[PDB]
Amino acid sequence: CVDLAAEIAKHCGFKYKLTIVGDGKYGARDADTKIWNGMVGELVYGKADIAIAPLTITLVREEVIDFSKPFMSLGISIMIKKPQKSKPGVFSFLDPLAY
Amino acid sequence: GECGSALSLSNVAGVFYILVGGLGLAMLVALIEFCYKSR
Amino acid sequence: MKVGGNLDSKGYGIATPKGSSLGNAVNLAVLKLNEQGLLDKLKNKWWYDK
Amino acid sequence: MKVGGNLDSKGYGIATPKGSSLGNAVNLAVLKLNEQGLLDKLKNKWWYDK
Structure with a gap:
């Protein structure tokens, strides 16, 4: 949108100042x-x-x-x-049984 | 509303146990008849 | 990861105070930039090119 | 079967010869019909109801 702002300003022939929205919000009505x-x-x-x-x-x-x-x-x-489909151990081969 | 793979060693390990008591007794009777009857 | 289809379909527009004199000229600028194929190049540039 | 997401996102509109006098009134009728929830019911009727 910085590049777009430059393009729009070129096509409409205006100077502009980029200002970050004070609240960091898009815009909503309380x-x-x-x-x-x-x-x-x-x-x-x-x-x-x-x-x-x-x-x-x-x-x-x-x-x-x-x-x-x-x-x-x-x-x-x-x-x-x-998520990962494949995960490998040593003896999960043996895991159906316990130490 | 507030409400909205493994291995069982135990199970047959018991049968390990019993199997082994079977072993010890088996050999007991064994050498008691061997010693007793034989000698 | 993005899963499933989109729930809705909409777009972004350049907004002005109601009755601003820029609104029309900005809109036509947007139309030209779309018709030039610039937006696809810029989207590739900032999304996928790197 | 329909596979994958849609390649683009667009809609159908009621079209008139350029400068037809019906265009505005028809457009507002379409807006009302959308706002009444009629189109979803008709879509269910002709897509899924049978």
Whole structure:
């Protein structure tokens, strides 16, 4: 997204400052207070003029901010720890019996 | 809600035991008839 | 390891405050960059090339 | 049998001649039908129900 930001800035002809989101969040609206945090809050409260990040296009976000057409496609997925099929001893040959 | 390979030495090791008592007695009777009857 | 299919299908977009004048031009820039094949090269560069 | 994951991720849309006046109203109808949960029921009906 740094390279993408450079490309976008070139194609649209603007100077930009990369700022790390204060809270390290993508952006969510506090239920009760209705306050957006993260980069969404940065846009909502005028702390930044554009967001160039892995910001998921969502309905609740599209209700409060504008999105370009998708530049990347993804889905929720599952990560598991790696496992090894093969593990070798000496006499596991003998292990069915005990010392 | 709060609720949501090995080896058994013992089992026949007993039969080891019994087998061995069988051994000792077997030899007892053995040398008691050998000594007793023979001599 | 990633196991199974994805649970949903969506994308990332460039977001602006509602009614920002950049939004349209940024969107068209994104369209050009997609149409140039740049995004596949950049994805390979940052995911798989190393 | 379907093997592996999908190679891409996309969808079907209702298409109109460019500048057709139906496009907007049809699109909002589609949005409502999605929001009603009708499409999942119809998909079950024509894919799996039989």
